[PDB]
CSV table of C-alpha atoms in Angstrom, one decimal:
chain,number,residue,atom,x,y,z
A,2,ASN,CA,-21.5,39.6,-33.4
A,3,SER,CA,-23.9,41.8,-31.4
A,4,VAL,CA,-24.3,44.4,-34.2
A,5,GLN,CA,-25.4,41.7,-36.6
A,6,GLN,CA,-27.8,40.3,-34.0
A,7,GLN,CA,-29.3,43.8,-33.4
A,8,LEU,CA,-29.9,44.2,-37.2
A,9,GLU,CA,-31.5,40.8,-37.4
A,10,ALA,CA,-33.8,41.6,-34.4
A,11,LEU,CA,-34.7,45.0,-35.9
A,12,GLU,CA,-35.7,43.4,-39.2
A,13,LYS,CA,-37.6,40.6,-37.4
A,14,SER,CA,-39.6,43.2,-35.4
A,15,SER,CA,-40.3,45.3,-38.5
A,16,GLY,CA,-42.2,42.6,-40.5
A,17,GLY,CA,-40.1,43.6,-43.5
A,18,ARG,CA,-36.7,43.3,-45.3
A,19,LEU,CA,-33.8,45.4,-44.3
A,20,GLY,CA,-30.6,46.1,-46.3
A,21,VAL,CA,-27.6,47.9,-44.8
A,22,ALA,CA,-24.2,48.7,-46.2
A,23,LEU,CA,-21.8,50.8,-44.1
A,24,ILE,CA,-18.4,51.6,-45.4
A,25,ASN,CA,-15.9,52.9,-42.8
A,26,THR,CA,-13.4,54.9,-44.9
A,27,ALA,CA,-10.8,54.8,-42.1
A,28,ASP,CA,-9.9,51.3,-43.1
A,29,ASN,CA,-12.6,50.3,-45.7
A,30,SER,CA,-14.1,47.9,-43.1
A,31,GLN,CA,-17.8,47.2,-43.7
A,32,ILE,CA,-21.0,46.4,-41.8
A,33,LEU,CA,-23.3,44.6,-44.2
A,34,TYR,CA,-26.8,43.2,-43.9
A,35,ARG,CA,-28.5,41.8,-47.0
A,36,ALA,CA,-26.1,44.0,-48.9
A,37,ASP,CA,-26.1,41.9,-52.0
A,38,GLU,CA,-29.9,41.8,-52.3
A,39,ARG,CA,-31.8,44.0,-54.7
A,40,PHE,CA,-34.1,46.8,-53.5
A,41,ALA,CA,-36.1,49.4,-55.4
A,42,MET,CA,-34.1,52.7,-55.2
A,43,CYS,CA,-37.1,55.0,-55.6
A,44,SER,CA,-36.0,58.7,-55.2
A,45,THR,CA,-32.4,57.6,-54.1
A,46,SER,CA,-31.9,57.0,-57.9
A,47,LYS,CA,-31.8,60.7,-58.4
A,48,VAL,CA,-28.2,60.9,-57.1
A,49,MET,CA,-27.1,59.0,-60.3
A,50,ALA,CA,-29.0,61.4,-62.6
A,51,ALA,CA,-27.7,64.5,-60.9
A,52,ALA,CA,-24.2,63.1,-61.0
A,53,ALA,CA,-24.5,62.3,-64.7
A,54,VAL,CA,-25.3,66.0,-65.5
A,55,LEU,CA,-22.4,67.0,-63.2
A,56,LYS,CA,-20.1,64.7,-65.2
A,57,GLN,CA,-21.2,66.5,-68.4
A,58,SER,CA,-20.4,69.8,-66.9
A,59,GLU,CA,-16.7,68.8,-66.8
A,60,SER,CA,-16.7,69.2,-70.6
A,61,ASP,CA,-19.1,72.2,-70.6
A,62,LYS,CA,-18.2,74.6,-67.7
A,63,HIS,CA,-21.5,76.5,-67.9
A,64,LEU,CA,-23.9,73.6,-68.5
A,65,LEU,CA,-25.5,74.1,-65.0
A,66,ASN,CA,-26.7,77.5,-66.1
A,67,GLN,CA,-28.5,76.1,-69.2
A,68,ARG,CA,-32.3,76.6,-68.9
A,69,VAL,CA,-35.1,74.1,-69.3
A,70,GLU,CA,-38.7,74.9,-69.9
A,71,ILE,CA,-41.3,73.6,-67.4
A,72,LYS,CA,-44.7,72.9,-68.8
A,73,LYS,CA,-48.0,71.9,-67.1
A,74,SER,CA,-47.7,68.5,-68.9
A,75,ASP,CA,-44.4,67.9,-67.2
A,76,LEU,CA,-45.9,67.8,-63.7
A,77,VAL,CA,-46.2,64.4,-62.1
A,78,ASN,CA,-47.1,63.2,-58.6
A,79,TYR,CA,-44.7,65.3,-56.4
A,80,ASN,CA,-43.4,68.6,-57.8
A,81,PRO,CA,-42.7,71.1,-55.0
A,82,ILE,CA,-40.2,73.2,-56.9
A,83,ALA,CA,-41.2,72.5,-60.6
A,84,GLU,CA,-44.9,73.5,-60.0
A,85,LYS,CA,-43.7,77.0,-59.0
A,86,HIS,CA,-41.9,77.4,-62.4
A,87,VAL,CA,-44.7,76.2,-64.8
A,88,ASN,CA,-44.5,78.2,-68.0
A,89,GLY,CA,-41.1,79.5,-66.9
A,90,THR,CA,-37.7,77.9,-66.8
A,91,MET,CA,-35.3,76.2,-64.4
A,92,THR,CA,-31.5,76.0,-64.8
A,93,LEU,CA,-29.9,72.5,-64.8
A,94,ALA,CA,-28.4,73.5,-61.4
A,95,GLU,CA,-31.9,74.3,-60.1
A,96,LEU,CA,-33.1,71.0,-61.4
A,97,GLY,CA,-30.3,69.1,-59.7
A,98,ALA,CA,-31.0,71.0,-56.4
A,99,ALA,CA,-34.7,70.4,-56.7
A,100,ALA,CA,-34.3,66.7,-57.5
A,101,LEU,CA,-31.9,66.1,-54.6
A,102,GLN,CA,-32.9,68.6,-51.9
A,103,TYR,CA,-36.6,68.6,-52.4
A,104,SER,CA,-37.0,65.2,-54.1
A,105,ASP,CA,-38.9,66.8,-57.0
A,106,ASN,CA,-40.1,64.1,-59.4
A,107,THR,CA,-40.6,66.5,-62.3
A,108,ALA,CA,-37.0,67.8,-61.8
A,109,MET,CA,-35.9,64.1,-62.0
A,110,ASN,CA,-37.8,63.6,-65.2
A,111,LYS,CA,-36.2,66.6,-66.7
A,112,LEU,CA,-32.8,65.2,-65.8
A,113,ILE,CA,-33.7,61.8,-67.2
A,114,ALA,CA,-34.9,63.4,-70.5
A,115,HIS,CA,-31.8,65.6,-70.7
A,116,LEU,CA,-29.6,62.5,-70.4
A,117,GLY,CA,-31.4,60.5,-73.0
A,118,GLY,CA,-33.6,58.3,-70.8
A,119,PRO,CA,-33.3,55.8,-67.9
A,120,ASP,CA,-30.9,53.6,-70.0
A,121,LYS,CA,-28.5,56.6,-70.2
A,122,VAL,CA,-28.6,57.1,-66.4
A,123,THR,CA,-27.7,53.4,-66.3
A,124,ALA,CA,-24.9,53.9,-68.8
A,125,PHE,CA,-23.4,56.6,-66.6
A,126,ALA,CA,-23.5,54.2,-63.6
A,127,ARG,CA,-21.6,51.6,-65.8
A,128,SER,CA,-18.9,54.2,-66.5
A,129,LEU,CA,-18.3,54.4,-62.8
A,130,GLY,CA,-17.8,50.6,-62.7
A,131,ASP,CA,-21.3,50.1,-61.1
A,132,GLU,CA,-22.7,47.0,-62.9
A,133,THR,CA,-25.6,46.6,-60.4
A,134,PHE,CA,-27.5,49.9,-60.7
A,135,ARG,CA,-30.4,49.8,-63.2
A,136,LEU,CA,-32.8,52.6,-64.0
A,137,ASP,CA,-35.6,51.4,-66.3
A,138,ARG,CA,-38.5,53.8,-65.9
A,139,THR,CA,-39.4,57.5,-65.5
A,140,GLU,CA,-41.2,59.2,-62.7
A,141,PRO,CA,-43.6,58.3,-61.1
A,142,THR,CA,-43.6,54.6,-62.1
A,143,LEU,CA,-40.0,54.0,-61.0
A,144,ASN,CA,-41.2,54.0,-57.4
A,145,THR,CA,-43.6,51.0,-57.7
A,146,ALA,CA,-41.1,48.9,-55.6
A,147,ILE,CA,-42.9,45.6,-56.4
A,148,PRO,CA,-41.3,42.6,-54.7
A,149,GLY,CA,-39.1,40.6,-57.1
A,150,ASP,CA,-39.2,43.3,-59.8
A,151,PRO,CA,-35.7,44.0,-61.0
A,152,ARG,CA,-36.6,47.4,-62.5
A,153,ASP,CA,-35.1,50.5,-60.9
A,154,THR,CA,-33.1,48.5,-58.4
A,155,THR,CA,-29.7,48.2,-56.9
A,156,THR,CA,-28.0,46.5,-53.9
A,157,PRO,CA,-27.0,48.3,-50.7
A,158,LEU,CA,-23.4,47.4,-51.3
A,159,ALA,CA,-23.3,48.6,-54.9
A,160,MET,CA,-24.9,51.9,-53.9
A,161,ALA,CA,-22.6,52.5,-50.9
A,162,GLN,CA,-19.6,51.9,-53.1
A,163,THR,CA,-20.9,54.2,-55.8
A,164,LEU,CA,-22.0,56.9,-53.4
A,165,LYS,CA,-18.5,56.7,-51.9
A,166,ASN,CA,-16.9,57.0,-55.4
A,167,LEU,CA,-19.2,60.0,-56.3
A,168,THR,CA,-18.8,62.0,-53.1
A,169,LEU,CA,-15.3,61.0,-51.9
A,170,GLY,CA,-13.6,59.2,-54.8
A,171,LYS,CA,-12.8,59.7,-58.4
A,172,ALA,CA,-16.1,59.6,-60.3
A,173,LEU,CA,-16.3,63.3,-60.7
A,174,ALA,CA,-13.7,66.1,-61.1
A,175,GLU,CA,-13.2,68.1,-57.9
A,176,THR,CA,-15.5,71.1,-58.6
A,177,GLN,CA,-18.3,68.7,-59.6
A,178,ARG,CA,-17.7,66.4,-56.6
A,179,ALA,CA,-17.9,69.4,-54.3
A,180,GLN,CA,-21.2,70.5,-56.0
A,181,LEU,CA,-22.7,67.0,-55.4
A,182,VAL,CA,-21.7,67.1,-51.7
A,183,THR,CA,-23.1,70.6,-51.4
A,184,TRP,CA,-26.5,69.5,-52.7
A,185,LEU,CA,-26.6,66.4,-50.5
A,186,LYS,CA,-25.7,68.4,-47.4
A,187,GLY,CA,-28.6,70.8,-48.2
A,188,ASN,CA,-31.2,68.0,-48.3
A,189,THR,CA,-34.6,69.0,-46.8
A,190,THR,CA,-36.2,65.5,-46.4
A,191,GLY,CA,-33.7,63.5,-44.4
A,192,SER,CA,-33.9,64.5,-40.7
A,193,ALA,CA,-36.1,61.6,-39.7
A,194,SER,CA,-34.0,58.9,-41.5
A,195,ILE,CA,-30.3,58.2,-41.2
A,196,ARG,CA,-29.7,61.6,-39.6
A,197,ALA,CA,-32.0,60.8,-36.7
A,198,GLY,CA,-29.8,57.9,-35.6
A,199,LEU,CA,-26.5,60.0,-35.6
A,200,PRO,CA,-25.0,62.5,-33.1
A,201,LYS,CA,-26.1,66.0,-33.8
A,202,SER,CA,-22.5,67.2,-34.1
A,203,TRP,CA,-21.9,65.1,-37.2
A,204,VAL,CA,-22.3,66.5,-40.7
A,205,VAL,CA,-24.4,64.5,-43.1
A,206,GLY,CA,-25.3,64.6,-46.8
A,207,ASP,CA,-28.1,62.3,-47.8
A,208,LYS,CA,-30.8,61.4,-50.3
A,209,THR,CA,-34.0,59.7,-49.1
A,210,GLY,CA,-36.7,57.8,-51.1
A,211,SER,CA,-39.9,56.0,-50.5
A,212,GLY,CA,-42.3,53.9,-52.5
A,213,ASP,CA,-45.1,51.4,-52.5
A,214,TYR,CA,-44.6,48.4,-50.3
A,215,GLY,CA,-43.8,50.7,-47.5
A,216,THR,CA,-40.4,51.2,-49.1
A,217,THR,CA,-38.3,53.5,-47.1
A,218,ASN,CA,-34.7,54.4,-48.2
A,219,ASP,CA,-31.8,56.7,-47.4
A,220,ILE,CA,-28.3,56.9,-48.7
A,221,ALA,CA,-25.7,59.1,-46.8
A,222,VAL,CA,-22.2,60.4,-46.5
A,223,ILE,CA,-21.4,61.0,-42.9
A,224,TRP,CA,-18.5,63.1,-41.5
A,225,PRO,CA,-18.1,62.2,-37.8
A,226,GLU,CA,-16.1,64.4,-35.4
A,227,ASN,CA,-12.4,63.6,-35.4
A,228,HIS,CA,-12.7,60.7,-37.9
A,229,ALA,CA,-12.8,59.6,-41.5
A,230,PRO,CA,-16.1,59.7,-43.3
A,231,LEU,CA,-18.6,56.8,-43.2
A,232,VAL,CA,-20.8,55.9,-46.2
A,233,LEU,CA,-24.2,54.4,-45.3
A,234,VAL,CA,-27.0,52.9,-47.3
A,235,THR,CA,-30.2,51.8,-45.5
A,236,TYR,CA,-32.9,50.3,-47.6
A,237,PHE,CA,-36.2,48.9,-46.1
A,238,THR,CA,-39.3,47.4,-47.7
A,239,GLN,CA,-42.4,45.5,-46.6
A,240,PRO,CA,-44.4,42.8,-48.2
A,241,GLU,CA,-47.7,44.6,-48.6
A,242,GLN,CA,-48.4,47.3,-51.3
A,243,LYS,CA,-50.0,49.8,-48.9
A,244,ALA,CA,-47.7,49.4,-45.9
A,245,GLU,CA,-46.7,52.6,-44.2
A,246,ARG,CA,-43.4,54.4,-44.5
A,247,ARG,CA,-40.9,53.6,-41.7
A,248,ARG,CA,-38.2,56.2,-41.5
A,249,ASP,CA,-37.7,55.2,-37.8
A,250,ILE,CA,-36.4,51.9,-38.9
A,251,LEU,CA,-33.6,53.6,-40.9
A,252,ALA,CA,-32.7,55.8,-37.9
A,253,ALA,CA,-32.5,52.7,-35.7
A,254,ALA,CA,-30.3,50.9,-38.2
A,255,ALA,CA,-28.0,54.0,-38.5
A,256,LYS,CA,-27.7,54.1,-34.7
A,257,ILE,CA,-26.9,50.4,-34.4
A,258,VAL,CA,-24.1,50.5,-37.0
A,259,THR,CA,-22.3,53.8,-36.0
A,260,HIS,CA,-21.3,53.2,-32.4
A,261,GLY,CA,-17.7,53.8,-31.3
A,262,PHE,CA,-17.1,56.9,-33.4
């Protein structure tokens, strides 16, 4: 069909490899493109870590208020919130918000450590029935995005299904689900990615990521006017280590797959 042809042409023109999974929750119809192929998640993996802490808060109502010390040695390559709290503390809620809304890599490492390591983030994914997601490394090395490296990868379809389950389905109890959605809706890094291909009237929660190999990612829950939500994963990557980030490709893919709503 013409949608598939447009995605093929977009990928061909890009020089890279495009992965798209759109789930239309009105009827669970899907638009898929390379949706069973692995892609490095980069900072999009942070949704799984934040959600795992939210799950824990179902059994400890006040867990999100618990404080975590931030030390100079904790700082990694991109720390916009954590660097302001060195030799102080952040709450787990502040760490979740920093990880998701500002893509703070130190905050992600604090979440990973809290949970018991990358393997435990993976174990949480498994508890949601996601057998595809794997987190293997901490920040910043989980963003290497090396072609053919299975570490810190998932598929667009597995991630769309999981994002749907987390934000709209039964992965989290209601208060926790609502908290995750609030965080994603407050993202500060996603206006040039999926959002840029959608009507301005639509409400969006998303989490972006980027990496080496010009890896450019975004995962989103989309609330169109007068319609059931859509869940969209757009992963993009290029064959050269130092290729530039291409958020415009994600915006273009988002526009191609969301007509008619």
